[PDB]
From a paper:
The paralogous lysine acetyltransferases (KATs) [name] ([name], encoded by [name]) and CBP (CREB-binding protein, encoded by CREBBP), are essential regulators of gene expression in healthy and malignant cells. [name] and CBP (hereafter: [name]/CBP) bind and catalyze histone acetylation, interact with transcription factors (TFs), and activate transcription at promoters and enhancers. A catalytic KAT domain (86% identity between [name]/CBP), an acetyl-lysine-binding bromodomain (97% identity), and several other conserved protein-interaction domains facilitate these functions. Here, we developed lysine acetyltransferase TCIPs (KAT-TCIPs) that redirect [name]/CBP to [name]. KAT-TCIPs recruit the acetyltransferases [name]/CBP to the master transcriptional repressor [name] to activate cell death in DLBCL cells.
To understand the determinants of specific ternary complex formation, we solved the crystal structure of a [name]-MNN-02–155-[name] ternary complex. This KAT-TCIP features a 4-carbon alkyl linker and induces potent activation of the [name]-target reporter gene and cell death with an IC50 comparable to [name]. The asymmetric unit, resolved to a minimum Bragg spacing of 2.1 Å, contained a BCL6BTB homodimer and two copies of a p300BD molecule, each tethered to [name] by MNN-02–155. A hydrogen bond connects the carbonyl of p300G1085 and the amide nitrogen in the MNN-02–155 linker. Five residues engaged in fortuitous interactions constitute a [name]-[name] neo-interface: p300L1082 contacts BCL6S27, while p300Q1083 contacts BCL6R24 and BCL6R20. The interactions are primarily hydrophobic in character. The identification of chemically induced amino acid contacts between [name] and [name] suggested cooperativity in ternary complex formation, a hallmark of molecular glues. Thus, fortuitous amino acid side chain contact between p300Q1083 and BCL6BTB enhances complex formation, providing a biophysical explanation for potency and specificity. The computationally predicted linker length of MNN-02–155 (6.6 Å) deviated by less than 1 Å from the measured distance between p300BD and BCL6BTB in the co-crystal structure (6.1 Å), validating this approach. The crystal structure of a KAT-TCIP in complex with [name] and [name] exhibited potency enhancement by fortuitous amino acid contacts independent of plasticity at the protein-protein interface.
Numbering used by the authors:
A (entry chain A): 7 to 128
B (entry chain C): 7 to 129
C (entry chain B): 1048 to 1159
D (entry chain D): 1047 to 1159
Write the structure that this text describes.
Amino acid sequence: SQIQFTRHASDVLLNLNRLRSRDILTDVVIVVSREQFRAHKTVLMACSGLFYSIFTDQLKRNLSVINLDPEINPEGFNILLDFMYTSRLNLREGNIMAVMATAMYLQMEHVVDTCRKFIKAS
Amino acid sequence: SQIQFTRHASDVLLNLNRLRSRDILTDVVIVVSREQFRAHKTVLMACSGLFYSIFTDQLKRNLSVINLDPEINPEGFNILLDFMYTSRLNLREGNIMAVMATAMYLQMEHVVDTCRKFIKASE
Amino acid sequence: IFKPEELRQALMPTLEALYRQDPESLPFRQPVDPQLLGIPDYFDIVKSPMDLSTIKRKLDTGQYQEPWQYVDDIWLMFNNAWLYNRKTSRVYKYCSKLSEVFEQEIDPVMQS
Amino acid sequence: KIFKPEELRQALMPTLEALYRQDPESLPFRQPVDPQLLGIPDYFDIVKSPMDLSTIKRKLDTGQYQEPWQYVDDIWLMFNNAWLYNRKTSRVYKYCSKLSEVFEQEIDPVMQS
């Protein structure tokens, strides 16, 4: 019955990326060691088990700043943040292990799974 | 040559709908005559020229409440809000004219265009 | 022989009396959506779903031949909820209260 | 003449690096123009041969320039794309003007040698 707009989801994602790129209505900064990343909490929650857990927790939901585990690699977070806003995952042999480790911590399981496929077919 | 996750965008949209449904991290109420609709401002901006303009305006970006034109039909808004969060547009002969009017006001042009196609093909 | 309109006139107030209960009817007014609600096991536990809206349709389309068939769907609906939801949960508690209300005013109607 | 990769790289790269050093002016120039992210879909209709600092840097480091005039052509293509595409009132056009000043100051010396 309802009409299906097959490009609508991509268009929303693109526009969300645009707002990120222009720092419009970002409501959190994610600190990964010394690096910092401005993002939208809802997009984070929508792509990550961990962010889902953090922002669902009432004692954290209204934080403006979230410090990740210091073990966490910034380049890895950054690749994944970009993935969250694009559907495009930049996997290279030089980054794969840091990307997967970061995905495992962020609870991005289909990413983690894709990483393992990349590793084994390497 | 990045890896392309073809279901990722829909998955994000679905999850955004889930948060809407549970009233998680909604930051605005859209008042359409007497009725009220909680939403996320970013999703609204992302789907609507008007909401884009409202929330990019510095004098309005931080408003928690937006009153639409009293002319605007609630059932029509609601159908479109649900479209924004689902990719699914519920067009019926009984609603089509109010849906299109609402889409024209919200500046959702591929919707408005689809509405015109629905009208013309209705026999 | 029960004609649609007879049952509809007899039974629809009992249905409408459930809807009138707020908030308790709210988990029950629409079919359970496992996807939106984020409970993917639902259709494994609950093999025959039922809700107020599906019952209302069946009345209005005169799909009940006898009142016991209406009463069966009402209990399927309540029983699905009691089965699926934890006893601590709000929707289970709402199920209990809603069931009270149904009993209160089906017993009269069923006598005729 | 015999211009070696390392020759050109050593001669020209300071001129490139001198552009990057300019801040904020180099910022619209450091990465290829992204029409989609930036929300300017006509870009690739106006600008049929894109160029930016990063693409030029690659070409140097990959020794894709045989002669310094080829490097200087890409730099001017880059500036010219910006002057073409951006309006004269706009910040990126104004940045283009400033950045081009700096390039001219840097390259005139180097091109004699």
